[PDB]
């Protein structure tokens, strides 16, 4: 699983791969780990699909009740704080790396990582899931804050692609969603149009010279690819 959420000026981009895996077999190839809580507050779900779906549905329902009774929009801080309480209360029972991210007119775009402990950290960008570990160095090097909405989406997609190229546990579609003052823009990049994969990267075309014909020289030529030669 690879989930991330970066802030641009107006709002946020959540991005996620689409693979749930029972270890080494892909149970679902097209999961939607970007889970609506309110109109403009989503979470990205890493860990036990059961546990995060259950929390996301519980928190979505509390936020809907809350929004009805205050008769106003919900702040992302509220969604994050509810999600933290639940992820903390049950920290021993559940496996659930969450990123709450969204727009509210008070604080604009906000990102909250709620990792496995039930910490809630407010961040400019958050990484989550098995694939997160690949991106920390990618962000350190290539991420520049104060991106456009369009640049953030392109970057978030390029990020998720870099993670799911190396993480076995991540793969499939890259789902993004931009949350800002405007109507939410979801989009789904299929793997055959991903911004990066190792399979298409020219760096990794020439094969490792592992096989090597039986020769009268220590000169490494290439792989033996024909029994006649």
């Amino acid at each position: 699983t690879t989930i991330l959420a970066v802030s641009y000026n107006g709002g946020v981009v959540l991005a996620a791969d689409s693979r749930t895996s029972s270890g080494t077999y892909v149970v679902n190839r097209a999961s939607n780990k970007l889970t609506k809580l309110t109109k403009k507050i989503y979470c990205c779900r890493s860990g036990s699909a059961a546990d995060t779906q259950a929390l996301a549905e519980r928190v979505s329902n509390y936020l809907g009740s809350y929004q009805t009774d205050i008769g106003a929009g919900v702040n992302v801080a509220t969604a994050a704080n509810l999600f933290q309480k639940m992820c903390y209360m049950n920290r021993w029972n559940i496996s659930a790396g969450i990123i709450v991210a969204g727009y509210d007119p008070i604080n604009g775009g906000s990102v909250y990582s709620i990792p496995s402990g039930g910490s809630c950290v407010k961040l400019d960008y958050a990484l989550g899931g098995s694939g997160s570990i690949f991106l920390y160095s990618f962000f350190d090097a290539n991420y520049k804050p104060g991106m456009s909405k369009s640049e953030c989406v392109a970057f978030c997609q390029r990020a998720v692609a870099h993670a799911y190229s190396r993480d076995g546990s991540s793969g499939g579609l890259i789902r993004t969603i931009t949350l800002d003052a405007d109507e939410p823009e979801d989009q789904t990049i299929p793997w055959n149009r991903s911004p990066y994969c190792m399979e298409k990267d020219p760096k990794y075309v020439t094969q490792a010279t592992q096989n090597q014909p039986f020769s009268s020289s220590a000169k490494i030529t290439g792989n033996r690819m024909s029994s006649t030669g």
Binding site: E57, R58, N61, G64, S65, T68, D69, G71
Partner: protein, 244 residues
């Protein structure tokens, strides 16, 4: 003895329920709901005698869910209490079943809650007629259709084409019943239906209303969410009524 607890009188009646119906009328406010081809309206008298009272604050109309509006007639705070129960009931339903509570179910569950307080001693009936309005998805074609469900203190739940609750409800119904012989009332445009509702209001209270002295709720097929109709749009309807 019959009159103070929730027990049958010799003539098989629950006096405390009969009296909670009197609480609905006591505040002297009238509401009128009306269902048209593609929308429901609910019009509530919104009288603030105090110039020092903040108009924005005193509402008879509450949102129960995005897609179910409510209008409570009777003890304002009893109304407020039933909305909290309705919201609880709707939240709870959405969690249990993962879909918005249908208005006809919500209404029926609220009738169940009312009936309980007519059968268990020591709980006061909520002296309020709840008028839920909202679209309901037809399972035959998927088309939304407008619904009004009233719940009264007895627990009696009913769907309506039009209904009135409050001060002069008998006179406002008489007007809507007289206007139902002329027109179809379910073939009407939102504008035409609004005029009928506001005219029933006007007939029953016996005075022309300002757009300020009513608050109007609304669900349409186009926009199924319960909206408060802005005073501008109501002003157009009251000019349209006073002409014809």
């Amino acid at each position: 003895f019959d009159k103070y607890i929730t027990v049958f009188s010799p003539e098989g009646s629950l006096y405390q329920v009969e009296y909670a119906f009197k609480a609905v009328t006591y505040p002297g406010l009238l509401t009128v709901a009306i269902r048209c081809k593609d929308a429901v309206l609910v019009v509530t008298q919104h009288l603030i005698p105090d110039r020092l009272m903040r108009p924005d604050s005193v509402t008879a109309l509450y949102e129960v869910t995005p897609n179910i509006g409510c209008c409570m007639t009777g003890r304002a705070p009893d109304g407020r209490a039933l909305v909290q129960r309705a919201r609880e009931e709707a939240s709870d339903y959405q969690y249990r079943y993962g879909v918005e509570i249908p208005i006809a179910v919500l209404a029926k569950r609220m009738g169940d809650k009312a009936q309980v307080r007519t059968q268990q001693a020591g709980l006061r009936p909520m002296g309020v007629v709840s008028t839920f309005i909202g679209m309901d998805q037809s399972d035959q074609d998927g088309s939304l259709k407008p619904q009004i469900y009233t719940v009264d203190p007895a627990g009696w739940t009913g769907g309506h084409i039009a209904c009135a609750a409050g001060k002069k409800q008998v006179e406002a119904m008489a007007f809507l019943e007289k206007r139902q012989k002329s027109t179809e009332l379910d073939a009407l445009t939102q504008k035409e239906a609004a005029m009928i509702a506001l005219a029933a209001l006007q007939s029953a209270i016996g005075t022309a209303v300002k757009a300020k002295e009513v608050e109007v709720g609304r669900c349409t097929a186009a926009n199924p969410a319960f909206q408060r109709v802005p005073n501008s749009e109501v002003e157009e309807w009251l000019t349209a009524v006073a002409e014809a």
